[PDB]
Structure formats: structure tokens, C-alpha cells
């Protein structure tokens, strides 16, 4: 199937109390493989997956230099964006950057992307074509003008549809023992009376590796998307994910409710029903 390589950066200004906290994380699909934390002991890019550890000292030296350089741009940009948005020097602000690429099962380039945020809102994003930018407001347009002039998109594209794709293909080959795995969801249903007259039917999906999943509740075919408590997909902590969906049903009417489980690692969408006596 399809794979991705993504880098995530967060820089948080610490007004007066030193330089900003920078955290960088690299992922292949949903598996973290590198990290850098400005507050950590090493002051270097560190391995986080066994299949990346086999990389040489020139690899870790380069990654360290290049991640620190990103950290320094972010430091400048925090002051620049405080200027653009007309904010005081007293408050703490955040810059978030996400960039990366997708490749198909043949390893062919599918998409490249870059999105930036300031204080948890869109700031600027590279468009799907990898040639143009979309600024979220008029201050962000100033960045766009500067990048359009500097031909930043061509420089970024060279990485997103070239450098990124080359190394993603390498990482997928180096981690072929673990990254090509897909674990399908282990499904089940639970029942919890909330009184003498009603009960919670809870539909579970555990140990699934493509974090993407769909859990829906239907009362006699008709969707119950308004009376469903859906929890955010969460990590089990061993690379697999978990999710549950719940509905409060009148006692004796449990058989009227169905839980539909759509996942990619599943041949056909699983249907679950409370097996009454």
C-alpha cells in the first residue's frame, strides 16, 4: 500500500526565560523514527526506531545540523510574526510546521506537502501543484511575497518530490521487516446498564495498525451519528491503535442496533450486533 514520510516541528517562545523550546519529530507512516528536543541532553537528532539506528555518524551529524538550522529559522520567524501580527514581547507564541511526501505501493511519488501555523491557526501552506502558496490572511501574504520572489517553492519542491521520496524509499527498504505490516482491528461489543431501563452499547476496535478507521452506529439501517459518543483514536503504545463508539439504548431494544467497522486491512466491512439471549 501507500506510505508517507513526515516531519513535525513545534517552536514555543519562552518570554524572558531563555530561547524557544524546539521539538522536531520524524515519522514513516504512523511510526516515529527520529526526534530532536532543544531541552534534551544529547543536543542531537536521535534515533527512535531500530531500523534507523544502522545509519552512520555522517547521517546523524547532517540531521543534527539541518534540524538545528530549522530551529534557528523558527526562532527568527517567531520575532518576525510577532511584528506582522503587532503583538507584545511578553506573550508566549507557537510556530508549527508539517512537511513531507507520499509514495504508492510501487514507490512512485504521489503528493508532497508543507503547512505552517502560528498560534495554532493556518499561516501559510504550499499548494497541491508544489508551485504556488496559500496565505491564510494579509500578514501571511508578506511571507508569500518574499517566498515567491526568492523562488522558495522550487527549492522546497526539489526536496518534496526528490530528496524526500529518495530517503522514504530507503527507510521503507531498511525497515521492510516492520513498516510493510498492517494489523486488522480485533472487534467486539460491550453492554453496560445505566439504569433499570437503559444501557450503553459500546463497539470496540483494538490492535489495528493503519490508525485510520470508521466505527458507525445504525438503528434499523438508519444512522445514529447524533446519539453516538465517539472517542478519538488513541495509541495502544506498541504501534497499534484503539477506538470505541457508544450508543445509549432502551433496555430490550439492543437487537435493533448494529455497529459497522470500515478499515482497509479488512476484506469486508464488519457488522456487530448485540447477541441477545
Amino acid at each position: 500500500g501507500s506510505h508517507s514520510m513526515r516531519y513535525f516541528f513545534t517552536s514555543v517562545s519562552r518570554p524572558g526565560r531563555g530561547e524557544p523550546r524546539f521539538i522536531a519529530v520524524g515519522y514513516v507512516d504512523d511510526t516515529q523514527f527520529v526526534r530532536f528536543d532543544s531541552d534534551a541532553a544529547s543536543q542531537r537528532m536521535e534515533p527512535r526506531a531500530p531500523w534507523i539506528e544502522q545509519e552512520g555518524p555522517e547521517y546523524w551529524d547532517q540531521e543534527t545540523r539541518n534540524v538545528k538550522a530549522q530551529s534557528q529559522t523558527d526562532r527568527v520567524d517567531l520575532g518576525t510574526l510577532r511584528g506582522y501580527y503587532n503583538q507584545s514581547e511578553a506573550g508566549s507564541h507557537t510556530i508549527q510546521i508539517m512537511y513531507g511526501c507520499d509514495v504508492g505501493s510501487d514507490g512512485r511519488f504521489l503528493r508532497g506537502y508543507r503547512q505552517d501555523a502560528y498560534d495554532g491557526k493556518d499561516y501559510i501552506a504550499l499548494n497541491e501543484d508544489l508551485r504556488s502558496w496559500t496565505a491564510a490572511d494579509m500578514a501571511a501574504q508578506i511571507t508569500k511575497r518574499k517566498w515567491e520572489a526568492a523562488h522558495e517553492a522550487e527549492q522546497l519542491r526539489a526536496y518534496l518530490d526528490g530528496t524526500c521520496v529518495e530517503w522514504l524509499r530507503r527507510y521503507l527498504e531498511n525497515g521492510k521487516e516492520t513498516l510493510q505490516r498492517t494489523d486488522p482491528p480485533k472487534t467486539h461489543m460491550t453492554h453496560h446498564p445505566i439504569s433499570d431501563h437503559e444501557a450503553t452499547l459500546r463497539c470496540w476496535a483494538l490492535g489495528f495498525y493503519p490508525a485510520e478507521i470508521t466505527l458507525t452506529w445504525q438503528r434499523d439501517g438508519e444512522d445514529q451519528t447524533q446519539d453516538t459518543e465517539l472517542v478519538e483514536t488513541r495509541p495502544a503504545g506498541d504501534g497499534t491503535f484503539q477506538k470505541w463508539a457508544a450508543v445509549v439504548v432502551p433496555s430490550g431494544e439492543e437487537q435493533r442496533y448494529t455497529c459497522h467497522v470500515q478499515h482497509e486491512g479488512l476484506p469486508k466491512p464488519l457488522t456487530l450486533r448485540w447477541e441477545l439471549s
Binding site: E63, A69, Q70, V76, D77, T80, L81, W147, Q155, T163
Partner: peptide, 9 residues
């Protein structure tokens, strides 16, 4: 691998 270059905002 992370980007080697980065243009400022």
C-alpha cells in the same frame, strides 16, 4: 532526511 535549506518568514 530533514530539509537542508529553509527560507525565513
Amino acid at each position: 532526511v530533514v530539509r537542508p535549506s529553509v527560507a525565513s518568514k
